[PDB]
Amino acid sequence: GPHMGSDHIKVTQEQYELYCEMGSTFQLCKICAENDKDVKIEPCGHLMCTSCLTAWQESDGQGCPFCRCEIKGTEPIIVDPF
Ligand SMILES: [Zn+2]
Ligand SMILES: [Zn+2]
């Protein structure tokens, strides 16, 4: 309900560095690796591409497909690199 507008997240060197060993980008969805996340899962804390999420929820819909657990907090946020 709340969090009308899109939130803003800040990336940390740790993350980039972590994903650096992989050769990818955080903001970049690790689902289709085509578009950014532009979303966030809470209270868990898993990011992903909504447009992709729907695909998951279109096949199941069992909360966050990352922790296969229901979601409480969700909204269109804007991922920003460091
Ligand atoms: Zn995507
Ligand atoms: Zn999750």
Curated annotation (Swiss-Prot):
<feature type="modified residue" description="Phosphotyrosine">
    <location>
        <position position="19"/>
    </location>
</feature>
<comment type="subunit">
    <text>Interacts with SH3 domain-containing proteins LCK, CRK and SORBS1. Interacts with LCP2 and ZAP70. Interacts with CBL. Interacts with SH3 domain-containing proteins VAV1, FYN, FGR, PLCG1, GRB2, CRKL, PIK3R1 and SH3KBP1/CIN85. Identified in heterotrimeric complexes with SH3KBP1/CIN85, CD2AP and ARHGEF7, where one CBLB peptide binds two copies of the other protein. Interacts with poly-ubiquitinated proteins. Dimerization is required for the binding of poly-ubiquitin, but not for the binding of mono-ubiquitin. Interacts with EGFR (phosphorylated). Interacts with IFT20.</text>
</comment>
<comment type="function">
    <text>E3 ubiquitin-protein ligase which accepts ubiquitin from specific E2 ubiquitin-conjugating enzymes, and transfers it to substrates, generally promoting their degradation by the proteasome. Negatively regulates TCR (T-cell receptor), BCR (B-cell receptor) and FCER1 (high affinity immunoglobulin epsilon receptor) signal transduction pathways. In naive T-cells, inhibits VAV1 activation upon TCR engagement and imposes a requirement for CD28 costimulation for proliferation and IL-2 production.</text>
</comment>
<protein>
    <recommendedName>
        <fullName>E3 ubiquitin-protein ligase CBL-B</fullName>
    </recommendedName>
</protein>
<feature type="region of interest" description="Linker">
    <location>
        <begin position="7"/>
        <end position="28"/>
    </location>
</feature>
<feature type="zinc finger region" description="RING-type">
    <location>
        <begin position="29"/>
        <end position="68"/>
    </location>
</feature>
